[PDB]
Amino acid sequence: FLGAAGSTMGAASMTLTVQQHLLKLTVWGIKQLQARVLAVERYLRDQQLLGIWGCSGKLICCTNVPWNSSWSNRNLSEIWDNMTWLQWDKEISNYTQIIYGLLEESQNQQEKNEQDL
Amino acid sequence: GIGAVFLGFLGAAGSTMGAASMTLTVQARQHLLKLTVWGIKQLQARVLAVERYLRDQQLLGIWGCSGKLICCTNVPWNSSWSNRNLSEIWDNMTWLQWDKEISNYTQIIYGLLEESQNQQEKNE
Amino acid sequence: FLGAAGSTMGAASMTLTVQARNLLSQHLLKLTVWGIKQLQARVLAVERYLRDQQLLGIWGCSGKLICCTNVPWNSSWSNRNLSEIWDNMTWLQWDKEISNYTQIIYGLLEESQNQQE
Amino acid sequence: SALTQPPSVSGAPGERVTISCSGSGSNFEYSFVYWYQQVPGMAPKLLIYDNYKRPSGVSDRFSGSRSGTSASLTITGLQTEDESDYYCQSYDSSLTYWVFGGGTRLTVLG
Amino acid sequence: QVQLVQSGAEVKKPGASVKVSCKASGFTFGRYSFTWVRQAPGQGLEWVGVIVPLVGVTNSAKKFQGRVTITADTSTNTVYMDLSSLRSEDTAVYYCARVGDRFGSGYAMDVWGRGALVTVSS
Amino acid sequence: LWVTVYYGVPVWKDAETTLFCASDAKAYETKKHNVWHACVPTDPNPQEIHLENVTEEFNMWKNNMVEQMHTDIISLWDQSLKPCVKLTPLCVTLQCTNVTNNITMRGELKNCSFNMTKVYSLFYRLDVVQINKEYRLINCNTSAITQACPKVSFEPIPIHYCAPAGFAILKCKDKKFNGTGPCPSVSTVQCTHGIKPVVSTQLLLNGSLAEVMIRSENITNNAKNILVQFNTPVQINCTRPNNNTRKSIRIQAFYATGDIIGIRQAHCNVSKATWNETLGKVVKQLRKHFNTIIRFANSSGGDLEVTTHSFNCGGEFFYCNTSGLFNSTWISNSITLPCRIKQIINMWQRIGQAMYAPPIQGVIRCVSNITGLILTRDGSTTETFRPGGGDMRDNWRSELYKYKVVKIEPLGVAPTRCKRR
Amino acid sequence: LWVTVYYGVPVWKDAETTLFCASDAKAYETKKNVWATHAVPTDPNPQEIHLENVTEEFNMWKNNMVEQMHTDIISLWDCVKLTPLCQCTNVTNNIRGELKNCSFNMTVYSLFYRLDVVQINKEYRLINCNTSAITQACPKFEPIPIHYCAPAGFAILKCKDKKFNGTGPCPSVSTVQCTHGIKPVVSTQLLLNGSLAEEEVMIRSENITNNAKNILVQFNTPVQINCTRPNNNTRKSGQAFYATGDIIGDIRQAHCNVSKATWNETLGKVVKQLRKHFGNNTIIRFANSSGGDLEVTTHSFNCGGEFFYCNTSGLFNSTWIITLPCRIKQIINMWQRIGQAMYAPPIQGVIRCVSNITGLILTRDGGSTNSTTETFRPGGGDMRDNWRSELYKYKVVKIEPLGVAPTRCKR
Ligand SMILES: *[C@@H]1O[C@H](CO)[C@@H](O[C@@H]2O[C@H](CO)[C@@H](O[C@@H]3O[C@H](CO)[C@@H](O)[C@H](O)[C@@H]3O)[C@H](O)[C@H]2NC(C)=O)[C@H](O)[C@H]1NC(C)=O
Ligand SMILES: *[C@@H]1O[C@H](CO)[C@@H](O[C@@H]2O[C@H](CO)[C@@H](O[C@@H]3O[C@H](CO)[C@@H](O)[C@H](O)[C@@H]3O)[C@H](O)[C@H]2NC(C)=O)[C@H](O)[C@H]1NC(C)=O
Ligand SMILES: *[C@@H]1O[C@H](CO)[C@@H](O[C@@H]2O[C@H](CO)[C@@H](O)[C@H](O)[C@H]2NC(C)=O)[C@H](O)[C@H]1NC(C)=O
Ligand SMILES: *[C@@H]1O[C@H](CO)[C@@H](O)[C@H](O)[C@H]1NC(C)=O
Ligand SMILES: *[C@@H]1O[C@H](CO)[C@@H](O)[C@H](O)[C@H]1NC(C)=O
Numbered sequence A: 001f002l003g004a005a006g007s008t009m010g011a012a013s014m015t016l017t018v019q020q021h022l023l024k025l026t027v028w029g030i031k032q033l034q035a036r037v038l039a040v041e042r043y044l045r046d047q048q049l050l051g052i053w054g055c056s057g058k059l060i061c062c063t064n065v066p067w068n069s070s071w072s073n074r075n076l077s078e079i080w081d082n083m084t085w086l087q088w089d090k091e092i093s094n095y096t097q098i099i100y101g102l103l104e105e106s107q108n109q110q111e112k113n114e115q116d117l
Numbered sequence B: 001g002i003g004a005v006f007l008g009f010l011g012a013a014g015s016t017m018g019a020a021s022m023t024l025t026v027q028a029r030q031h032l033l034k035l036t037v038w039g040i041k042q043l044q045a046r047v048l049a050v051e052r053y054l055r056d057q058q059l060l061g062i063w064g065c066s067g068k069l070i071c072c073t074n075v076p077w078n079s080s081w082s083n084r085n086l087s088e089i090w091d092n093m094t095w096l097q098w099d100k101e102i103s104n105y106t107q108i109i110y111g112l113l114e115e116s117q118n119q120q121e122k123n124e
Numbered sequence C: 001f002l003g004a005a006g007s008t009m010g011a012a013s014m015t016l017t018v019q020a021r022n023l024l025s026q027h028l029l030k031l032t033v034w035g036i037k038q039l040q041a042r043v044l045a046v047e048r049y050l051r052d053q054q055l056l057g058i059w060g061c062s063g064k065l066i067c068c069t070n071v072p073w074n075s076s077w078s079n080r081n082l083s084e085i086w087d088n089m090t091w092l093q094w095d096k097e098i099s100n101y102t103q104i105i106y107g108l109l110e111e112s113q114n115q116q117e
Numbered sequence D: 001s002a003l004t005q006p007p008s009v010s011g012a013p014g015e016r017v018t019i020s021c022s023g024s025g026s027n028f029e030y031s032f033v034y035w036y037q038q039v040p041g042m043a044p045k046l047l048i049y050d051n052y053k054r055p056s057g058v059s060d061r062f063s064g065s066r067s068g069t070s071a072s073l074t075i076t077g078l079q080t081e082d083e084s085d086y087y088c089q090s091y092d093s094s095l096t097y098w099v100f101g102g103g104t105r106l107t108v109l110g
Numbered sequence E: 001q002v003q004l005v006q007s008g009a010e011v012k013k014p015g016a017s018v019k020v021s022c023k024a025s026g027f028t029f030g031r032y033s034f035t036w037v038r039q040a041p042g043q044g045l046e047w048v049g050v051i052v053p054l055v056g057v058t059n060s061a062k063k064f065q066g067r068v069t070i071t072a073d074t075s076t077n078t079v080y081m082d083l084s085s086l087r088s089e090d091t092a093v094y095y096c097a098r099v100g101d102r103f104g105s106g107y108a109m110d111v112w113g114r115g116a117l118v119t120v121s122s
Numbered sequence F: 001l002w003v004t005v006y007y008g009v010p011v012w013k014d015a016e017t018t019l020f021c022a023s024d025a026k027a028y029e030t031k032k033h034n035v036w037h038a039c040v041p042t043d044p045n046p047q048e049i050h051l052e053n054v055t056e057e058f059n060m061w062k063n064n065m066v067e068q069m070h071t072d073i074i075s076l077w078d079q080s081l082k083p084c085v086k087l088t089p090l091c092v093t094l095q096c097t098n099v100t101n102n103i104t105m106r107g108e109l110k111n112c113s114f115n116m117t118k119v120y121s122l123f124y125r126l127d128v129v130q131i132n133k134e135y136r137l138i139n140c141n142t143s144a145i146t147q148a149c150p151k152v153s154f155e156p157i158p159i160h161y162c163a164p165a166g167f168a169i170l171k172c173k174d175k176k177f178n179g180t181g182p183c184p185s186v187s188t189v190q191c192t193h194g195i196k197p198v199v200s201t202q203l204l205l206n207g208s209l210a211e212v213m214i215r216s217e218n219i220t221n222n223a224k225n226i227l228v229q230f231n232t233p234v235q236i237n238c239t240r241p242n243n244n245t246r247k248s249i250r251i252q253a254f255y256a257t258g259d260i261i262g263i264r265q266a267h268c269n270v271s272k273a274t275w276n277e278t279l280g281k282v283v284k285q286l287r288k289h290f291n292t293i294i295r296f297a298n299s300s301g302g303d304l305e306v307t308t309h310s311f312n313c314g315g316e317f318f319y320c321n322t323s324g325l326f327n328s329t330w331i332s333n334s335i336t337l338p339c340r341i342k343q344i345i346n347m348w349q350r351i352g353q354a355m356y357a358p359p360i361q362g363v364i365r366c367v368s369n370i371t372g373l374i375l376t377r378d379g380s381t382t383e384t385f386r387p388g389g390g391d392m393r394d395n396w397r398s399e400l401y402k403y404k405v406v407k408i409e410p411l412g413v414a415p416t417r418c419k420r421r
Numbered sequence G: 001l002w003v004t005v006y007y008g009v010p011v012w013k014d015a016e017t018t019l020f021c022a023s024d025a026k027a028y029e030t031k032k033n034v035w036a037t038h039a040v041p042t043d044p045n046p047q048e049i050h051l052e053n054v055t056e057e058f059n060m061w062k063n064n065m066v067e068q069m070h071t072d073i074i075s076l077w078d079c080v081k082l083t084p085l086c087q088c089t090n091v092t093n094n095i096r097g098e099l100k101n102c103s104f105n106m107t108v109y110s111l112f113y114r115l116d117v118v119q120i121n122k123e124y125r126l127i128n129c130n131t132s133a134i135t136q137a138c139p140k141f142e143p144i145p146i147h148y149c150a151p152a153g154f155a156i157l158k159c160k161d162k163k164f165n166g167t168g169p170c171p172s173v174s175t176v177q178c179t180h181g182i183k184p185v186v187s188t189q190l191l192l193n194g195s196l197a198e199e200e201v202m203i204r205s206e207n208i209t210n211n212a213k214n215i216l217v218q219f220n221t222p223v224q225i226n227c228t229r230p231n232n233n234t235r236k237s238g239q240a241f242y243a244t245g246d247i248i249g250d251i252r253q254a255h256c257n258v259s260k261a262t263w264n265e266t267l268g269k270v271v272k273q274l275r276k277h278f279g280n281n282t283i284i285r286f287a288n289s290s291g292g293d294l295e296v297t298t299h300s301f302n303c304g305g306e307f308f309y310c311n312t313s314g315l316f317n318s319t320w321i322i323t324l325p326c327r328i329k330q331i332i333n334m335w336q337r338i339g340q341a342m343y344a345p346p347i348q349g350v351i352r353c354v355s356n357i358t359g360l361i362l363t364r365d366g367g368s369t370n371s372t373t374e375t376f377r378p379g380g381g382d383m384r385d386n387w388r389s390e391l392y393k394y395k396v397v398k399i400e401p402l403g404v405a406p407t408r409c410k411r
Helices: A009-018 A021-053 A076-083 A096-116 B003-008 B015-028 B031-062 B095-102 B107-123 C009-012 C027-058 C091-098 C100-117 D025-029 F025-029 F066-078 F273-290 G065-077 G127-131 G261-276
Strands: B070-075 C067-072 D008-012 D016-022 D032-039 D044-048 D060-066 D069-077 D085-089 D104-108 E010-012 E018-023 E033-039 E046-052 E057-060 E068-073 E078-085 E092-101 E116-120 F002-006 F013-016 F018-020 F055-059 F110-115 F119-124 F126-129 F134-138 F144-147 F160-162 F169-171 F181-183 F188-189 F203-205 F213-215 F226-251 F253-261 F267-270 F293-298 F309-313 F316-320 F328-330 F333-343 F353-356 F362-377 F383-388 F403-408 G001-005 G012-014 G046-050 G056-059 G089-090 G100-103 G109-112 G117-119 G125-126 G153-157 G167-169 G173-176 G188-191 G213-216 G226-230 G255-258 G281-288 G300-305 G306-310 G357-366 G373-378 G394-399 G404-406
Touching: A009 A021, A021 A096, A021 C027, B015 F002, B031 B107, B031 C027, B070 B107, B070 F055, B070 G300, C027 C100, C067 C100, C091 C100, C091 G404, D008 D016, D016 D085, D016 D104, D044 D060, D085 E046, E010 E018, E018 E092, E018 E116, E018 G001, E033 G226, E046 E068, E046 E078, E046 E092, E046 F353, E057 E068, E078 E092, F002 G100, F055 F403, F066 F403, F119 F226, F119 F333, F119 G153, F119 G373, F203 F226, F203 F309, F213 F273, F226 F273, F226 F316, F226 F333, F267 F273, F267 F316, F267 G056, F273 F293, F273 F328, F273 G012, F293 F383, F309 F362, G056 G394, G065 G394, G188 G300, G226 G306, G261 G281
Parallel strands: D008 D104, E010 E116, F119 F253, F144 F353, G281 G373
Antiparallel strands: B070 F002, C067 G001, D016 D069, D032 D044, D032 D085, D060 D069, D085 D104, E018 E078, E033 E046, E033 E092, E046 E057, E068 E078, E092 E116, F013 F403, F018 F160, F055 F181, F110 F119, F126 F134, F169 F188, F169 F403, F203 F362, F213 F226, F226 F253, F226 F267, F226 F362, F267 F333, F293 F328, F309 F316, F316 F333, F362 F383, G001 G404, G012 G394, G046 G173, G056 G167, G089 G100, G100 G109, G117 G125, G153 G173, G153 G394, G188 G357, G213 G357, G226 G255, G300 G306, G357 G373
16 A cells, blocks of 8 residues: 555545565564554554444445535645645644544434434 | 453443443554564464454354444344343343343344344345 | 355355354474464464455445345356256356456446445 | 271161271371272272362262371261272372272171 | 273183283373272282383382283373283282372372273182 | 344353463563573553452352463473483482481481492482382382482462453452452453462462461361461571582482581471461451361371471472471460471372482571461361361462453343334 | 355365475474474364365376475475595405495595495595585484465365376365375385375376376385394594594495385286276386486485485386395485485494385386387486375365355345
């Protein structure tokens, strides 16, 4: 996933779906092993997050909570087209906690309505 | 680490089943050579825990629950299993008390879940 | 783990769960290097499993074993009698008959979920 | 390194009986005492070991204890199914060779 | 289910030698031991010998010194006793008894075989 | 209504899982030779999450850590004797002589001399048996003895116990808890406290400290041993006042005990007053299960590991009377103990197998805590409690009386008034 | 109909992977280290689940485990490294042939073999010093079963049918969690401690009809071969130049004994099988290796820590319608590579090891004569074929549990 860095979100979205000599080997073997596990565990925590929002590993998900203009917003076209979006997070970075709350609240109300109906 | 998660699920054991429900969503969030050996067992335990969490997830997968936490299913609850009203069964009991009475019927319920989901997808 | 591999397609449809939970399937240095091979194996099992899980995740299943879709089967990928499909057409040969079309099926499935979104 | 037992002691049903086991040698004071119940035609069965410990699954009416340089096996509530031979054994750890007592006969009146 | 199966009864001419066998019943030797006790008919039983298959150490009663050979095989979980120069004094039933528990920490004789009856007659 | 599943609610079911050892960094670093195997160090982060409105039926006489953790000691200790050298050819017809250069001892030591492939050696009366001035070791032929390597020692090292993920340890914290039945305070911890592999008979040396508690599988039963944990420790200092001389003989290298520098018997000491006070606290607690008559008589008999008080002191194993501490009678209303030294010892009551203690040079002194007692009720005048002990299991149960291993099943069901679509 | 995905369907594909060894519990028991007893000592638990009504074709030729394990032994195969780059006389103290002793100065004498040394132009030299920087191996060869267990993404299949002769669909297939006692037979033109079949002796070759490739033969009746090394020698040593000491006693060369009756019975069954696939008129003949170096012509195998180049001239001595001396040199060019030595220390005392012959490596001659007769000669040199006789009924299949099929359903 790291190689794709440095491209627009219109370009990134498509690329996303496809996506002793013994002593040196034994120690740095563990570290390579150590990294592999933190790959899986970090993956699950994300999957848990996407679970409560209503996605659960759908990659390009969706949600029914609007994008208020209070968040850093511009014309949608430029965000898709020309803005490299490794810097897009730098725009929505101090707003990234409250927005998850709206994602958190949206599913909870959505399931409650489903529970009633 | 996942190791603390499991007894994190055990943090509030005596609380009411209703109390655990909301807390669940809140819960949804030569010294070199000796350092080599300890690296194995510390790593060996952790990857084992991962399999434990996947196995339950896969078990939750067979039933109509995907990966959600507070899941629901449309299989009727016959009165034969612990006939008792829904009112008290969520306030004055504890999970430890609840399953101990149920522990005579865990497997039949799990089996009862399997075909309950199974029939749903074919005729969908 | 394979079980009734060559059995009738209908037979395999019943036993897909594979019994539910069974479906997943110098002295200091000498002992250490053995451990690395053991741990490297187990994590390799998990990584392969999740990639398959996420592969189902892109599709409208996300880990539901049997999973109906919304893609109508085109009558061009070497189709035969529907009864024969679940009478004698065993799974393994059913793969060899499809072969190339799996990439077509994989590509076809991807767009249907996205256009749903 | 020799153990002495009474030849035969009988007991009325429902009463309590005791059997002595006296062995010469200071080593007798440095070695355990076991007791074996033996049906006159069957194989021995362990009855009490380590001088007071009952093996799992043995009737609680059997219990014995040491007394200086002698041993004693006490039965409470003798029934008509407890008539057999009772052997006291002293395992000399130093010399590494078990020694079996002569054998005491118990008969229930009836 | 733990048992010490044995060979059948034997009749031997005096001056010969006897072999008696005992086989495990679902366990290896591990750390346990084995011992042999003989009982003359109408008589209190008496000790014969002992072996520890884990370390291959042996011992026997002074009376049978130089007359008893105690053998073991870790492959087939069997212990054989070879008593030499049988006479009328050795007309007795020979039990093989297990000793100890999962750690070899005991000294008693808890599990007993059925009993092999060796007869010496002229 | 219908049923709903809740992945994560707390659930318990008693089960047995293979735990793993736990140690400390500095403690592991301080491991010259093998005074006792690399072990995982545990991060000092005791979760100790105190549960409220919780109650789990603890047990101690059916616990499975005791059988587990005892087995860990046996396997570890077997490895302590593996790399060392067998003493199979060592024994030969000896020429020991009752030489008494000094008398405290009373001729306990012997000036043994063997015609090796002709060197003298010292051996106490315990480790050698007369034969028929000719003698031999207690059990070399028709037996098997393996001397411990001289470099290694035998000082205990604290060990913690941690369960793998999916299994949690329940620790009882109630002050008054005899061992069985429910415990109010059930604190869930992953890594237990500093278990000590203390090797000792009826006198529990330097273990965990308790009021004095009385714990028994069944008091009515005389068979089961009664464990008593002391609330207040009683200091015990015990010394070997003789400088041992270690002579290496190239046979492999045997280590004979050379002539002692200048002869006083090893002896233990106990503060008589403090012992008297603690025993009254014991007898006052015993009377709770029973006014009555209580008498103490010394160990009735048996092997030298039970008749006396066996314990380890700086790599040397002592056998000492306890007749000076268990001779009293009590109604409703310093002490020196003679000792003996053995070098050929067969710990854990194993036939054939035994280890030879290599000599330790100088005067040996050690101090520890008398925190636990093991008493055996005799078979309605008075209930004489003789000191028993014996089975090595009990000395573990004085520490693991307050821990259990439970399997957690986060999955669960409930009949909720809700339906799917 | 609509496409519906299925996860967990029993479907696999022919795949190649680097398998991991799973040695037995006795790896550390004989770990003196031994190139074969080296510890992954994973508990070899075999589970042979049978299948039903399914058959797939194996291919023992052009296989993957044949070369996958071949390199695994090489890594296990590869202490003191000598390269003794820097005078001898015939010794006849007690004479078959005559050995030789070489007098030299080390920074003494050494008892070599005739084949081990080559004259320089009497004075001889080490055959391997001038050719390459040879490297004497460790003084410190016990084959042990190594049950292969597949990684969780792969499975190992077995052909329970005993009539599989090399290629084609095997009727009965049973998936195997962990393979059987595959062992490093490590020998030429003869299988030693090999696997025994339970039917008539089997014939198998890549293209039997043609002389291009070797012929593999299965046995059912083993043959015992005894070889002895009755000699005693010392060792001479910073600069550790390990030569050999003087011979203590008679100057005796090694020899071997071979049975006759059982060997005769085997060939007839071999002849009968050859009669099955060649006709009932042609004459079968046996000869020798009219070519190939010592490692090919001579029967080389491991026995008592030394490798014996036994002399198989007498075995292939027949025509169809007793003791063969072994001829040893200390240089062991076992993996047919210029550079390696394995100068094994001479073992003291007789050996007389127990052997077990289970297979043959035969090579056809030319096609000079048509329909009259053909000569079969001993072969070898590439012991890749040697291991093909143990894994011929095994394969690794990459399970691909994802599966798709059409059905009439909506969602
Ligand atoms: C603790 O130990 C005492 C014994 O010291 C146990 O009491 C014993 O309980 C058993 C039954 O479990 C009694 O056996 C039965 O006794 C009745 C007469 O009371 C008899 O009719 C039956 O045929 C049978 O023999 C035994 O006699 C009794 N002994 C005594 C001295 O009370 C007690 O149950 C144990 N409790 C625990 C903690 O397990
Ligand atoms: C435990 O307490 C008992 C009494 O309270 C002590 O009993 C004494 O045991 C010794 C053992 O050496 C006896 O000495 C021996 O007596 C026999 C009797 O025939 C004699 O033949 C020996 O030569 C030797 O003298 C001693 O007599 C006995 N006390 C009395 C008053 O008889 C015992 O020592 C204490 N300790 C142990 C470990 O049992
Ligand atoms: C353990 O202590 C007891 C007493 O404390 C010792 O027994 C004494 O033995 C002598 C020997 O004749 C008697 O004269 C004394 O009367 C005994 N003591 C008492 C109080 O009666 C015993 O010897 C000690 N154990 C050992 C092994 O020596
Ligand atoms: C064994 O040692 C004992 C002394 O402990 C001696 O009497 C006996 O003769 C020795 N020989 C035997 C029988 O092994
Ligand atoms: C195998 O041998 C046959 C007959 O000589 C030949 O025609 C064919 O090309 C050879 N190649 C194969 C199939 O291996």
